[PDB]
Structures are given as C-alpha cells and as structure tokens.
Design an enzyme around this catalytic site. Sequence first.
Site, PDB file in Angstrom:
ATOM      1  N   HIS A  96      67.745 113.077  20.897  1.00  0.00           N
ATOM      2  CA  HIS A  96      67.958 114.290  20.073  1.00  0.00           C
ATOM      3  C   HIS A  96      68.727 113.949  18.793  1.00  0.00           C
ATOM      4  CE1 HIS A  96      68.464 118.514  19.277  1.00  0.00           C
ATOM      5  NE2 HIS A  96      69.777 118.463  19.422  1.00  0.00           N
ATOM      6  N   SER A 126      70.301 121.101  14.886  1.00  0.00           N
ATOM      7  CA  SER A 126      70.055 121.206  16.346  1.00  0.00           C
ATOM      8  C   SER A 126      69.570 122.630  16.645  1.00  0.00           C
ATOM      9  CB  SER A 126      71.278 120.794  17.126  1.00  0.00           C
ATOM     10  OG  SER A 126      70.990 120.728  18.514  1.00  0.00           O
ATOM     11  N   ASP A 184      63.334 112.875  22.141  1.00  0.00           N
ATOM     12  CA  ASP A 184      64.263 114.018  22.323  1.00  0.00           C
ATOM     13  C   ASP A 184      63.984 114.635  23.700  1.00  0.00           C
ATOM     14  OD1 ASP A 184      65.876 116.270  22.183  1.00  0.00           O
ATOM     15  OD2 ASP A 184      65.409 116.676  20.075  1.00  0.00           O
TER      16      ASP A 184
END
EC number: 3.7.1.-
Length: 398
Positions: free
Chosen positions: A378, A255, A350
């Site tokens: 995401h 991330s 995302d």
Amino acid sequence: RWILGDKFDTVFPHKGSLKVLWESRWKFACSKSVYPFHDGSIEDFEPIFNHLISKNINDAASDEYTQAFLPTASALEEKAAQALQAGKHEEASNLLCRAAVVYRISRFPYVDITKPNSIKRVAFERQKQAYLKATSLWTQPIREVTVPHTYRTGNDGAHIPIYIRTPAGADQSNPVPIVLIMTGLDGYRPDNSQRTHEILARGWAAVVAEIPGTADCPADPADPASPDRLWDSVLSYLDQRPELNTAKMVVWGLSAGGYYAIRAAHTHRDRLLGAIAHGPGCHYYLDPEWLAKVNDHEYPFEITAAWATKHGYKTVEEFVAGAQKKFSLVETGIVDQPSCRLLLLNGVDDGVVPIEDCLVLFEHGSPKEGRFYKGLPHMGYPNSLPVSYEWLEQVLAS
C-alpha cells in the site's frame, strides 16, 4: 481472483503482534523518520514500544496502548517550553513536532468520531495544540482556519477546520497555485509537514482537509453526497482568498483520501486542474471477498472496525453487507462522467485496497494517468513520492 495473487491468502506475520510490527517494520520506519513516523525520532519511541512489548499489549484500539505514549509527549512539551524560555525557537519547534508524532502514533490507527471521551480523541486534541505551537515558529507558519460549512445539509456539522500554509511573497497581485491535501483514516491535518515544505518550495500554497468519517470533518459519514457539499464549502472559501489562485488548483488524496480525490476529480472537474489519488480505493476495496482478508495484510492493525465507523455504519456486519453498493464510485456511477487530469499512484501488491481500484478507472469516463510499482504494498512508498511532485510541476506549469 486478485492481481495481489497468492499473497492475498498470506496471513502477514505482524497480525495481532505489536512485537513483530515494531521489530520487522515500524522500528525501521521510525529509524528512517518515514510514514507513519515522519518528523519523529527513534529515541522517543524505542522506550514506549519496549514497554508495550514487555506488557504484551497488541490491541492499538486499547487505552493501555494509547496511555503508554502520553508521558513521553508531556516530557517533550516541557523540554520545548525550556528551549523556548532560552530563545531556542528551532529546538522548541523540533521538540513540539516530536511530541506531535508521539501523539500521532498513540492514536493509530483511528480516532473514533462517535467516542468524544476516547483517549485517542484526547491524544489528537493534544497533537493539534503541539503541532500549531511548533509551526507558529516557522517563517511560513501553518495557520488553522475554521471554514463555515455554508453548503451543510441534513446531519452535516457547521465547521470545517483546515490548515493553510502560503509561500514567501504570496500576494493578491499574483495569486499562487493551490495543492489541497485530502487526508486519510490514520493521517489527519497535522501529519503532512514534508508535503507542505515541498509544495511551498515550488511556490504553491498547501491546504489540508480531513475526509468524511474522520477527525474534525463535519460531513455526514453515512451520506455518500456529503463530500460534494464539503468541497463546495472549502473551494468557495479558497475562491474568496485574494492570494490563492483556484484557477491553478490540484487535489491530493492520501490512502483513504484517494477515494475523495477520485470523486472530486469528477464532481468538481470544472474547479480543478488535476487530482492525485495516492493508494486509493473506489469499488473493489468494499467487495465482501476483499474485506474477508483485508485484516491479514500490511495494515499495522485491524482496519475493518475503523472502516465501518468512517463509512457511517453502527456495526461491521452492516458495513461488509451494504458499503460497496452505497459508496462504490463505480456502482453509484460517479466514474461515468468526465474528470480533470487524475494521477493514480500505488504498489501493485497493495493488500489494503486492491490495485484493481486504480485499473478499473481506465474503463470509465476520461483517460486516467497512472504509475503502479511492481511488488510494492500500500502507497508504493518511497518510490511513489518524487513522481507526485514531477506531475504537480507539469500540471501547475506557467
């Protein structure tokens, strides 16, 4: 304007609503024991969220949110102590891991690096204690090493706490390959148990390090060059470890960590066989037009305040105004050099970081590798996880 399309303008139903977050997504993630509830149990969380929902607590950043978790965590620690007293090490380990996940969710989404008395900081400290106790009972334990930051300059701190886990038989006679995990905004070094299991199962060492502006990372968050100095210290430490082969090393950015995996793929290309950037931002995630709507998408709570602090900004206004030109790997020209093999993994839809931040990297420097998941948000979980290991096997192949 974005590949996300009309969904860019959608206000997600869980925005400002912990009730909807729980009832529509988190209850199920918890039930399935998948991120962010990996290693966790629904029995520990159902009572806490029932309490939060009854009290109409929605602001994760509030103390009322964090404190709802702490008694449950304490109860699990005492149950672990009782298990350990009876010589039930497996049960004690499992209970301490469950306490660690309770602490993890209590400090979602962000430990404020500028607030050392914050209850979320207290929760993170307790999480690390519980996690190290839990993993000390593992056949292959997670050990913490405080790597001296020899490459520190300016406002950099002196100490880099990392987790290292080595497979059965890892010896200086045949040093093992290394997977270095770079954690994110809400995931820190204790939040990667299954990744370490999978890395060790393939005969590799797992190393875990937090990124600038998070957790216990000493890197100056406001200096874009600070991660370069950080990985110089970490890699130089790993070079000197007899049983670890830095000639067969891959970085794995998760991330917010994706940015740092992309950056290191360029800055440390001569010291890495490969990099995986999982749900990464590098340029368009800091576009003011993107930041204008980022709080309306799939991230469980408001993200821009946390992002502002993690990028070393005193205010969100300054972050929105200044961040892209200062930190973009495109604007700063980091992408305009060769890189080691770089695997980009993400959901096409995302709404946290744009899929454009994967796509733009194919227009600079060395060829990049990618798999992007149609219609997924995401990280593209769970689809994006198995391919990570297939790729690591190919890159670290003997």
